[PDB]
Amino acid sequence: QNVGTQAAEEPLNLPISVCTAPGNCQTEADAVVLDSNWRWAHTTTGYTNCYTGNLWDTTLCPTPETCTTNCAIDGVPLADWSGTYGGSVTGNKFNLKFVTVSTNIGARTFLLDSTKTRYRMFQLLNREFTYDVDVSSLDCGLNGALYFVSMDADGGAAKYPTNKGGAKYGTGYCDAQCPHDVKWINGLANSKDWTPIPGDANSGKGYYGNCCAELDIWEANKQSQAFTTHPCTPNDQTRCEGVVCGDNDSGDRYNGMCDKDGCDFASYRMNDHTFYGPGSTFKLDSTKPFTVVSQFITTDGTDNGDFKEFRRFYVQNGVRIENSKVNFPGITAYDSITDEMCAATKGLFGDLDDHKNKGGMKQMGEAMRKGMALVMSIWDDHDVNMLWLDSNYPPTGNPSTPGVARGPCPTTSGVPSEVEVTQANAVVSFGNIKFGPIGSTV
């Protein structure tokens, strides 16, 4: 995309901590940038929309190349962050409102480095990543997500010279779902064969998808939470078409370059229904804030080893809370993501181990070694109504069959039109982000 001249781009300042030992950290003066999908797209030498509602203008965008020549994405000024997009920062806390009323629904954002010209790339192997979260106002059907993806640090600017904005304009998004709803891919409008998504007034799908590796630290609302590894072959940003995208709609979910299911550790799905929930007698009380700690263990305990284990623990009101465990007869009580856990649990659930097909923890680790961009988002799910996270999936499945039940939400929950009314004022908060060696962040 070209860059427009109507509004300066002003990312929100967000300090994080880089740590060397427990309680010995230094501030890193980073910032938050809005994903290019949420930006106004208009004519390069005017005010005329190139995209309105869920459609590209066919006169301006008869082809992707012409669209890209004629159109530009514009900046987010400071005033518009809260007023238009529902984003705000107080000290080291970042807040994202779900619906902001001209009416904005959801948000996806990235962490910029201290220069505000590149994404802050995190080399996560043999490191610990930690943050405080509040998901108390997110119920069934919503997801306040924090995760990493194998985006380029410059959003693709060096690879795709028609991308003028780079990381500064939140470009280059890709993930392990190979999404077609990304409006700008490889420096070009994804306007070919663009199709609105029914019941989604703001979104559509273009000819291409954009694939890359994804490490989900946090997919969650107050009812259920998960962390998940998604390797791809290769891991780096890859525009896809046809079978390579692994499109759900053509029966290709397991035929593409990315592991779409991922290998998940989701406490409720692993059959501990009392670990996490909205109340003081759950082990971890989702009505109150808490700290989420993630440790990425290698084979030799060094930065050069292969990724072998994703460990997790929590801190809430000064109380250390170890992760829940897998709880099925004849299955080891795993409390972390490893290749063995993935094989054993997917075996039990009858899920295809595409994680293993894509190179497993080792391949996931190669993405983490090269460095990944931090994503913070809030969203509802127009495909599957978040049932995969917090309900029975498939909805018609027996909840006593291992793998089906992922949370207590009813199978009628999560319809975007309903959650966008009922949960309009939901806000996820991510704060006090800390990064360092294992054992350094609490």
Buried b (16+ CB within 10 A) or exposed e, 365-384: bbbbbebbbbbbbbbbbbee
Contact call for residues 38 and 84 (beta carbons, < 8 A): no
Amino acid at 46: G
CA-wise closest residue to 208 among 191, 223, 225: 191
Chain length of the chain: 442
Contact call for residues 436 and 18 (beta carbons, < 8 A): yes
Q: To which residue do tokens 């263990």 refer?
A: 297
Contact call for residues 429 and 94 (beta carbons, < 8 A): yes
Residues pairing with 321 in the sheet: 314
**Do the bridges between strand 2-3 and strand 71-73 make them parallel or antiparallel, or are there none, so unpaired?**
parallel
Q: Report the alpha-carbon distance of residue 99 to residue 424 in Å, rounded.
A: 5
Active-site residues: which are they?
214, 219
Q: Report the alpha-carbon distance of residue 378 to residue 87 in Å, rounded.
A: 11
> Hey, what are 431's tokens?
């704060």
Q: Report the alpha-carbon distance of residue 156 to residue 162 in Å, rounded.
A: 10
DSSP 167: G
Contact call for residues 243 and 256 (beta carbons, < 8 A): yes
CA atoms within 13 A on the CB side of 15: 9
Total Cβ atoms within 10 A of residue 204: 21
Method: X-ray
**What phi and psi values does residue 339 have, to the nearest 5 degrees?**
-55, -45
Q: In whole angstroms, how far apart are CA 325 and each of 128, 321, 329, 340?
A: 20, 12, 12, 14
Contact call for residues 110 and 383 (beta carbons, < 8 A): no
Give the total number of structural domains in the chain: 1
Burial of 60 (0-12, 13-18, 19+ CB in 10 A): buried
Q: Report the alpha-carbon distance of residue 221 to residue 423 in Å, rounded.
A: 12
Q: Report the alpha-carbon distance of residue 228 to residue 266 in Å, rounded.
A: 8
Instruction: Note down the domain range covering 166.
Output: 2-442
Q: Report the alpha-carbon distance of residue 94 to residue 88 in Å, rounded.
A: 6
Q: Report the alpha-carbon distance of residue 170 to residue 441 in Å, rounded.
A: 28
**Do the bridges between strand 276-277 and strand 284-285 make them parallel or antiparallel, or are there none, so unpaired?**
parallel
**Helix, strand, coil percentages, rounded to 5, for the chain:** 15, 35, 50
Q: Report the alpha-carbon distance of residue 314 to residue 294 in Å, rounded.
A: 9
Header resolution in angstroms? 2.0
Q: What angle do CA 281, 283, 289 make, to 5 degrees?
A: 95
- Whether the bond into 234 is cis, omega within 30 of 0: yes
Q: Report the alpha-carbon distance of residue 390 to residue 141 in Å, rounded.
A: 8
Contact call for residues 105 and 141 (beta carbons, < 8 A): no
Contact call for residues 95 and 26 (beta carbons, < 8 A): no
SS3 78: helix
Find the CATH number of the domain harbouring 375: 2.70.100.10
Q: Report the alpha-carbon distance of residue 311 to residue 361 in Å, rounded.
A: 13
Contact call for residues 60 and 71 (beta carbons, < 8 A): yes
Q: To which residue do tokens 């593409």 refer?
A: 256
Total Cβ atoms within 10 A of residue 301: 11
Total Cβ atoms within 10 A of residue 306: 16
Q: After which residues is the chain broken (C to N over 2.5 A)?
A: 101
